[PDB]
Design a protein around this ligand. Structure first.
Ligand SMILES: [Zn+2]
Ligand SMILES: [Zn+2]
Ligand SMILES: [Zn+2]
Ligand SMILES: [Zn+2]
Ligand SMILES: [Zn+2]
Ligand SMILES: [Zn+2]
Lengths: 56, 131, 171, 329, 185, 48, 144, 163, 86
């Protein structure tokens, strides 16, 4: 919300009310310099032990 | 020496939570706070003017009677009774010898308490304990 | 003291190890990165038990690193020091400030203030040693030390012990 | 070269929790106490110990290490200081919030003016979200001008059930400048006096855990008492770097200028109240300290004067640096 | 005034003397807001009781602190290091303690011989403050009524024949105002 | 020396490192000076 | 008499001390001139105001002035309150002299350099035991 | 989820947070804290080492025993085994029970007291002759077991001491 | 693990999405550039991206895509079983 308008006013209200931000949105992740959960970031790529052994 | 630690002078008024304690080795009163700071590291000379007998923190206990002198007699009695312990049946009901034995046991305690013959009495007590 | 604990670690594998025997590499990485290591929360991790039955979870590819992070659950023997505990060890080093007692993978340092007044530093003897009428303390000697304090760092543990208490010192 | 290898685990941030610093926490976080309003010693060669540019707060020079972490400019994240204000000062951005809380609770015992015995309140207390719940409570409590030591019982209006109260009539609070002024209605003209910041701090500390939770605050992360500033954290030099044009002339950030002013006002107040200093003189000093702190955090206050540097341009506050199209966000 | 200020100010911070402000209306001159100084025994007794306890507590803590091992100090950076902290900074040679910031041998801290001095200081304090403790005990036995500007005025002894200050209390009628600490039981 | 410490919390074994833009670090410190506590945490308190 | 807190850039590979260092400002790197190894990266090159620590020393002060929206009541009181600062009084006398010396130099159509010299001279020679029974006019006139 | 904000002490049996009496294993089943004495730990560690050696292969006086452990340790352990070498050397030079039978008897002996795992392990690790020595070396024992039982236990423990 | 939907009740699309393909090729290509073992016979290729594309065509990429649902639950889909039709 602070990224749009009234940055300081919104942040002050967050401090007093002890708001909790889950960083599920793009704006939160952009500030924190981490992959957003969008497009190529909406999933996690794991290892396939069962397939990996059989490919040899 | 009424309601305060003789060493740190912590009276009940300024510290109601403080508690007193004594050590059997020299029967010198000392509050719990003093004990922790003086004896936590290890054994040391008693913090009294004229007392140089080493003592251990684990040996501390709480006084039962309000008289220091009476506490000495009971403490010596406890150790003495652990070895000098004979019942009437021990002498087949013969009270004449039992009474004399009781007097001798009490006599040993009396001599030890007042230090009449500390060297000789202690040796006899040590010798009897083995038997 | 030696404890048996169930610990977990996040191990990272370089992509070069993505092979059919990568599980063997994972087990290896645990051995040369866990065994012999020191942790302030669990103490010195000495040995790993049930090495053939280590639970391996699915690995996650890091976004930009390109490696895989695996959560490994294992059982290991850990030596953790605690203040107020009594341990036995052998003196390894001597100095004016005090001597170091070796206990397992940890070294306990005893300061002069924590030692009995009788002991005095004697640098004239080779090696330097603490000389007292009742006993003499030098390297390789047997000493019973009571741990007085411990500081636990993320990757290091140091403790201070004393021999002033009764039944301590030379055995 | 980059950052040197470290041993701490690398993890991504998954949650952000907002709150306010307690006076105890700010003192614990701080690594050095600031007491001198200067930046350089008399020799103008090294930073003064205990000054604004204390070496313990960090370093902004490539050639100087941080006395605390012993790391270079590219590795030290900065370490906070703290200034012990002579008197508590309101937070410029919370005065509106403070005013609402003052009207909601009694100014003598710290209890909510309206309890659960009122049907209207029961609806208000049922609101889940804190923001709308807070608005509901204010609309009802602000209109009550008595503590109501005795309240009618909910079973029937015949008998009165005793409730924790004091019977003191509450004042009509209005904001004048940076001070809170409360007026008491007599049983001719109403009584008027200035509500001291110390009085406000004392009352807010009396509010029970359940009392201010109903107002939306968090017992552990943000309490009404923490809005009033008793200890001011001092940002490290990186937040307020010292710029240079020809590198032979040293310039200070706008924040450092205000921080020096705050300390000078703080020390002046301490000396005044320590000896003599009649009541009006101290109040003038207190107002100066409040104005300096408020303008330091926000230089754009309606109806209040602006802090102007010797050049005459307005001082850039922290609020200004965050807002706008060119701000941090 | 410059001499009465510091005396009143210090005697007010410690709460040994209370202040009372009221509006006095002389009939044949411009009025003025008068300041009156008195003593509130229940508050003054509490202030002294806490301070007496606090002073003794600091010495007790210092006595306990001194009994702890000395520690170490660095001559250059003047940083205090405890025994536990120093053990993790000694050189590889295991001969001397090396500072972290300076990498220079440490120097033993002082206060080793003060163990007796701190105990002596504590002994003097209790003996010297003995009259206060005895007085408090008697004070505790009885109950003291809180004093107020009006109540204290009952025992007044006028200082001067013609004092410009009107030693009278005239509370405003129907005054709902309540000031911090201006009300008594 | 591979040592970490958080004065006030008295911990040395519960330290994490995060990668954030320097602007983000500056923002949080600026909020700290304004009496606002931006608390960065790794483990989520509540589920989605 | 204080902590070193000094950083010296030396090339570990070359080990030559003192080293030859070239600051590639355009590339923002500090590189050893012999081997080319980069020793430091991300090198750094209105929010603040400049001050001269030769004529004013260490004195950070900010004036109070009207804003886009303000009431005369608050502005007047703060200036009145700000004036009664015991600590700032000592340095006000020096600033007051700097004001008077400027007026005299300005009325003399003298160059800015002359004004700078005279201003510094007064501060250096001010607050001295010898200059205790001399009129301020003599001090200012002599300084010019 | 409040988070935000007892010092460890062996005497008070306050081992901290990660060494509580109730422990949770990798399988989720609750279990009691497992504390091993010097002799038991030596066998447990040595038991794992031989098992690891067997897996790789398929796919006595104090002096001679010490050499066997040292050679065994290096063969069955990887690099950076400095800590392990010190542990094995220390364990062999401070162990009082050699074979499984002796330790098995020791375990079957001390478990009758029902004491805490920490203190019971200490009793089997420290050589103490009198009940007073046990009480002071391990302060946790105070007001936990009568001297009559402790005195008998110490006598029996010293009876089954090899060499 | 209540958040791991059983393989028999997976309700997500059985077709690889454009975003899934982009990351799989990029992630696998990044690994190959770090001397990762190649499971496909190469008839001459130097660009890691091209090698990754060849592996995807022949279904020789040992990766599993974890699709996250809005409630925190997830489904594991192997790259081999995912149909690449886009
Ligand atoms: Zn005492
Ligand atoms: Zn004694
Ligand atoms: Zn730093
Ligand atoms: Zn009330
Ligand atoms: Zn130093
Ligand atoms: Zn070079």
């Amino acid at each position: 919300r602070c990224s749009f308008e009234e940055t300081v006013e919104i942040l002050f209200e967050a401090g007093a009310s002890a708001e909790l931000d889950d960083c599920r949105g793009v704006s939160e992740n952009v500030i924190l310099g981490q992959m957003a959960p969008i497009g190529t970031g909406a999933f996690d790529v794991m290892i396939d032990e069962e397939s990996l052994v059989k490919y040899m | 020496n009424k309601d305060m630690c003789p060493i740190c002078k912590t009276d009940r008024y300024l510290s109601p939570d403080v508690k007193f304690l004594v050590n059997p080795e020299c029967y010198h009163r000392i509050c719990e706070s003093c004990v922790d700071r003086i004896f936590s590291l290890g054994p040391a000379q008693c913090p009294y003017k004229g007392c140089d007998k080493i003592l251990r923190k684990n040996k501390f206990k709480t006084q039962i009677f309000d008289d220091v002198e009476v506490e000495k007699e009971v403490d010596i009695r406890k150790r003495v009774f652990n070895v000098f312990n004979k019942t009437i049946d021990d002498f087949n009901g013969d009270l004449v010898e039992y009474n004399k034995y009781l007097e001798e046991v009490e006599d040993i305690i009396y001599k030890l308490d007042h230090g009449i013959d500390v060297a000789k009495t202690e040796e006899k007590l040590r010798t009897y304990e083995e038997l | 003291m030696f404890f048996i604990k169930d610990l977990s670690l996040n191990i990272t594998l370089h992509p070069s190890f993505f092979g059919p025997r990568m599980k063997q590499y994972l087990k290896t990485k645990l051995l040369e990165e866990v065994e012999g290591s020191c942790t302030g929360k669990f103490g010195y991790i000495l040995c790993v038990l049930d090495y053939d039955n280590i639970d391996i979870q699915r690995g996650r590819i890091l976004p930009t690193d390109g490696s895989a992070e695996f959560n490994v659950k294992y059982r290991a023997v850990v030596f953790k020091p605690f203040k107020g505990e009594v341990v036995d060890g052998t003196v390894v080093s001597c100095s004016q400030h005090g001597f170091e007692v070796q206990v397992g993978p940890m070294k306990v340092f005893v300061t002069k203030h924590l030692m009995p007044q009788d002991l005095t530093f004697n640098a004239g003897s080779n090696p330097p040693s603490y000389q007292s009428s009742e006993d003499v303390i030098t390297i390789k000697s047997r000493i019973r030390v009571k741990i007085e304090g411990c500081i636990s760092q993320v990757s290091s543990i140091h403790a201070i012990g004393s021999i002033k208490e009764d039944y301590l010192g030379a055995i | 070269v980059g950052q040197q290898y470290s041993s701490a685990p690398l993890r991504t941030v998954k949650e952000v929790q907002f709150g306010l610093f307690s006076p105890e926490e700010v003192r614990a976080i701080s690594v050095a106490k600031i007491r001198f309003p200067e930046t350089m010693d008399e020799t103008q060669t090294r930073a003064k110990i205990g000054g604004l540019n204390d070496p313990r707060l960090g370093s902004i020079d490539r050639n100087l290490k941080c006395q605390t972490c012993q790391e270079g400019m590219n590795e030290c994240p900065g370490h906070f200081g703290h200034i012990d204000l002579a008197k508590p000062v309101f937070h410029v951005g919370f005065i509106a919030k403070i005013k609402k809380v003052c009207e909601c609770v009694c100014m003598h015992c710290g209890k909510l003016l309206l309890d659960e015995h009122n049907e209207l309140m029961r609806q208000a207390l049922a609101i889940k979200d804190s923001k709308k719940r807070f608005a509901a409570i204010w609309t009802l409590c602000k209109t009550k001008m008595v503590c109501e030591t005795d309240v009618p019982s909910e079973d029937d209006p015949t008998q009165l059930v005793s409730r924790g109260g004091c019977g003191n009539t509450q004042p009509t609070i209005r904001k004048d400048g940076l001070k809170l002024v409360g007026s008491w209605k007599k049983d001719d003209e109403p009584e008027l006096r200035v509500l001291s910041t110390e009085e406000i701090l004392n009352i807010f500390k009396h509010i029970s855990v359940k009392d201010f939770t109903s107002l939306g605050f968090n017992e552990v992360f943000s309490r009404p008492e923490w809005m009033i500033l008793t200890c001011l954290p001092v940002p490290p030099p990186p937040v307020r770097p010292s710029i240079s044009f020809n590198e032979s002339q040293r310039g200070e950030d706008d924040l450092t200028f205000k921080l020096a002013d705050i300390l000078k006002a703080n020390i002046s107040l301490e000396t005044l109240e320590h000896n003599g200093a009649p009541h009006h003189a101290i109040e003038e000093a207190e107002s100066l300290l409040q104005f300096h702190v408020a303008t330091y955090m926000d230089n754009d206050i309606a109806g209040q004067p602006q802090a102007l540097q010797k050049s005459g341009r307005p001082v850039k506050s922290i609020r200004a640096r965050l807002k706008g199209k060119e701000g941090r966000i | 005034k410059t001499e009465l200020g510091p005396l009143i100010a210090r005697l007010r911070s410690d709460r040994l003397i209370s202040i009372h402000k009221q509006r006095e209306y002389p009939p044949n001159s411009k009025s003025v807001e008068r300041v009156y100084y008195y003593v509130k025994y229940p508050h003054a007794i509490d202030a002294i009781k806490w301070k007496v306890h606090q002073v003794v507590q600091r010495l007790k803590d210092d006595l306990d602190k001194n009994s702890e091992p000395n520690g170490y100090m660095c001559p250059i950076c003047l940083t205090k290091y405890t025994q536990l902290e120093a053990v993790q900074l000694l050189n590889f040679d295991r001969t001397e303690f090396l500072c972290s910031l300076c990498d220079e041998p440490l120097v033993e801290d002082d206060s080793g011989k003060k163990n007796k001095e701190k105990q002596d200081k504590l002994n003097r304090l209790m003996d010297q403050i003995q009259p206060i403790i005895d007085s408090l005990k008697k004070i505790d036995d009885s109950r003291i009524e809180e004093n107020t500007f009006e109540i204290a005025l009952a025992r007044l002894i006028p200082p001067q024949n013609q004092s410009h200050a009107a030693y009278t209390y005239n509370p405003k009628k129907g005054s709902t105002m309540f000031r911090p600490g201006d009300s008594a039981p | 020396h591979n040592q970490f410490e958080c004065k006030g919390c008295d911990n040395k074994i519960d330290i994490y490192q995060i990668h954030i833009p320097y602007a983000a670090k500056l923002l949080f410190q600026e909020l700290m000076a304004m009496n606002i506590t931006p608390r960065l945490y790794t483990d989520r308190s509540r589920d989605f | 008499r204080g902590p070193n807190l000094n950083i010296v850039l030396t090339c570990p590979e070359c080990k030559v001390y003192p080293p030859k260092i070239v600051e590639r400002f355009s590339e923002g790197d500090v590189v050893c001139a012999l081997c080319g190894l980069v020793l430091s990266d991300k090198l750094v090159d209105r929010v603040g105001e400049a001050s001269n620590p030769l004529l004013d020393g260490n004195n950070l002060s900010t004036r109070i002035g009207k804003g886009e929206t303000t009431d005369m009541r608050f502005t007047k009181e703060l200036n009145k309150a700000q004036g009664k600062n015991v600590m700032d009084k000592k340095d006000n006398e020096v600033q007051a002299a700097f004001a008077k010396i400027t007026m005299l130099c300005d009325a003399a159509e003298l160059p800015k350099i002359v004004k700078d010299c005279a201003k510094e001279a007064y501060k250096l020679c001010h607050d001295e035991k010898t200059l205790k029974g001399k009129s301020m006019e003599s001090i200012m006139a002599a300084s010019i | 989820r409040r988070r935000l904000k007892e010092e460890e002490n062996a005497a008070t049996l306050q081992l901290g947070q990660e060494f509580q009496l109730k422990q949770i294993n990798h399988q989720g089943e609750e279990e009691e804290l497992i504390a091993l004495n010097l002799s038991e730990a030596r066998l447990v560690i040595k038991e794992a080492l031989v098992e690891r050696r067997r897996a790789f292969k398929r796919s006595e006086t104090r002096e001679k025993e010490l050499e066997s452990i040292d050679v065994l340790l290096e063969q069955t352990t990887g690099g950076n085994n400095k800590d392990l070498k010190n542990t094995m050397q220390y364990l062999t030079n401070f162990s009082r029970f050699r074979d499984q039978e002796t330790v098995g008897a020791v375990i079957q002996l001390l478990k009758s007291t029902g004491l805490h795992p920490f203190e019971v392990a200490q009793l089997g690790s420290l050589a103490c002759d009198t009940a007073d020595e046990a009480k002071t070396l391990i302060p946790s024992l105070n007001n936990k077991i009568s001297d009559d039982e402790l005195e008998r236990i110490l006598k029996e423990l010293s009876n089954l001491e090899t060499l | 693990k209540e958040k791991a939907i059983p393989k028999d009740q997976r309700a997500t699309t059985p077709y690889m999405t454009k975003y899934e393909r982009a990351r799989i090729l990029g992630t696998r290509a990044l690994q190959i550039s770090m001397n990762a073992p190649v499971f496909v016979d190469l008839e001459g290729e130097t660009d890691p991206l091209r090698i990754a594309m060849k592996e995807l065509a022949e279904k020789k990429i040992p990766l599993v895509i974890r699709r996250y649902l809005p409630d925190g639950s997830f489904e594991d889909w192997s790259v081999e079983e995912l149909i690449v039709d886009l």
